[PDB]
Nucleic acid binder design. Sequence first.
DNA 1: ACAGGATGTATATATGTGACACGTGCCTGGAGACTAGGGAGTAATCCCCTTGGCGGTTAAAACGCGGGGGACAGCGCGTACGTGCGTTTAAGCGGTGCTAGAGCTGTCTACGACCAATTGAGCGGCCTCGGCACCGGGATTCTCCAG
Length: 48
Amino acid sequence: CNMRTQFPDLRLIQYDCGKLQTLAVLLRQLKAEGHRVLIFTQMTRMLD
DNA sequence: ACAGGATGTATATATGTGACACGTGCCTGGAGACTAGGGAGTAATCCCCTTGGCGGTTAAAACGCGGGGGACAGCGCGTACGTGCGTTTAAGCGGTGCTAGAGCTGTCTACGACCAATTGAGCGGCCTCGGCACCGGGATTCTCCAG
């Protein structure tokens, strides 16, 4: 099955998107400090 | 699971009350030469309305879910409508036998169109109050269980 058709991963949604990559790094670094975060974005379906 | 007993077709035939054929005539297309007016072919103006869609919030759909009271099936019975039979009513299918009134023809005005003016409705274009529209009471009115 794997060797005949390749489907998009769908699991790690940070794959294509460098915005989410740097956000993952940033949130991971902030987690040690644990002081909590507001993440603002317009585009209601980007919050998804 | 039959058979009298009816009713319904199917096939054939013929001559006479309607379908076709043929000649005529004569009103009506067809053909032709002018004269607009009408409509087409562009060229300008003014609108509205889609642009692509997004993410907030709302009303309207849409869905769950009980349950109740109507949609049907069952059963019955009790008229009432068809079925058939005898009568008789009166319509049909031909006739005779007037004259009322279509249908037409002609004649001739009153009537319609044109026809250039003329003007006075009328329609558009803003303005400005009343009049519905929605609201917020409280008081009569229904609807639903409850005895």
